Amino acid sequence: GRLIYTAGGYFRQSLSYLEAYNPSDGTWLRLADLQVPRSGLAGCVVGGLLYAVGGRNNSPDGNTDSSALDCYNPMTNQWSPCAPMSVPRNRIGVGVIDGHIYAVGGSHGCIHHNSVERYEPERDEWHLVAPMLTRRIGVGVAVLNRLLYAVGGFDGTNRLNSAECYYPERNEWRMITAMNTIRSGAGVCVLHNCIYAAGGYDGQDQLNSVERYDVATATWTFVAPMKHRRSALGITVHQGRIYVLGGYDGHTFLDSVECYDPDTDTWSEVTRMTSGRSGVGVAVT
Ligand SMILES: C[C@@H]1CN(c2ccc(C(=O)N3COc4c(cccc4-c4cc(N5[C@@H]6CC[C@H]5COC6)c(C(=O)O)cc4F)C3)c(Cl)c2)[C@H](C)CN1C
Incomplete structure (x- = not known):
């Protein structure tokens, strides 16, 4: 079994929560808090370890962008600092x-970075790779066919x-077909050989629309929109379905968790987070 982990976030100030949702029984585990509160971070998993990357601590005492990389082991319930990145990266x-x-x-x-860096857990080292063609904050990232989008x-x-993609063997970036919609702070993930871009902000409105990139045709197609429009949402894939967690819709910090079934092209509300928040990092292990 695997759980959906949500780390950090924002509600009045940046948060330290680490919680894990089990889609089978609907429960949330309250796990060890992050050592430093952060919103605008991203999560990922390597070798069963969860990583919280970048972000910012927006507190009543000030704002500090983060270059931190922290590692959480579900077996030990402990966070450990890792080597920091070359620069702080909020909304990473x-x-x-x-x-x-x-x-x-x-x-x-x-500073809006176009730079990109790569971490090796086996050496606890970061190194810069070729920079993107465009500076991007509130950026969605997808890995598909050993390319980084x-x-x-x-x-x-x-x-x-x-949107653009990175070719690791060549160490170069190339622009790909642009989305139908402008999306800043969307959730981006890969499901069944396709990239999905859900929600985000188009410059005027918070979006509930969701579009899917098909590699072979190089086209973005709209699929079923979410019930609740949202930006700065968490997103992940668990057992063939997409889960979106929280976010901000222009008025409320959402606790809604929606789940997309690609077979029926439908979104269903499946649970709520224990408290409404935006700007979380999410990963499954
Ligand atoms: C004082 C509070 C502070 N709030 C907030 C404070 C903190 C957050 C938050 O979690 N972050 C800060 O942003 C992000 C986080 C993570 C990923 C993307 C963004 C982000 C949000 C943007 N914004 C678009 C879409 C969401 C956001 C605002 O709406 C236009 C924009 C944009 O502008 O393109 C670009 C982004 F990369 C972490 C948020 Cl979401 C709201 C609210 C604004 C309400 N206020 C009263």
Whole structure:
């Protein structure tokens, strides 16, 4: 069995919560808090270990963007610091290829990174790789066919419908077909050989629309929209279905968790998070 882990987030200030949802029995485990509160981080798993990457601690005492990489072992219920990234990356995107973590874009104050760096858990080291063609914060990241895709975001001036992909063997990026919609702060994941981009902000409205990229045709197609429009949502895939967790809709910090079934092309509300929040990091293990 695997659980859906949600780390950090925001509600009034950046949060330290680490909770794990079991889709079989509907329960939430309350696990060890993060050592430093953070929102705008990303989560991922390598070798059964959960990683919390980047983010920002927005507290009553100030705002500090994070270059941290922290590792949580479900077997020990303990967080351990790892080697930090070259720069702080708030509103970061992350993807894993061959057990290596890619930290994509994100911001440090007013700096909107196009830089990308890769972590090796086997050496506890980060190294920069080729930078993206576009600066991207609030970026979605997907791994498909051993390529790393960076989708949407905000480049420091405009919110983006563009997307690009990274070729690890060549160490280079190329632009791909742009989405139908501009999405800054969307949830992006891969399911059944397709990239999904759900929600996000188009510059005027919080979105409930969801679109899917088909590699062979290089096209983005709309699929069933979510019940609740949201940005800064957590997203993951568990047992052939997509789960979206929380987020912000322009008025409320959502506790809604929706689940997308690709066989029926329908979204269903399956649980609530223990408290409404946005900007979480999510992963499954
Ligand atoms: C003081 C509070 C502070 N709030 C918030 C404070 C914190 C958060 C939060 O979790 N973060 C900060 O953002 C993000 C986080 C994670 C990923 C993406 C974003 C993000 C949100 C954006 N924004 C778009 C879509 C969401 C956000 C606002 O709406 C336009 C935008 C944009 O602009 O393109 C770009 C983004 F990369 C972490 C949020 Cl979501 C709200 C609210 C604004 C209410 N306020 C009263």
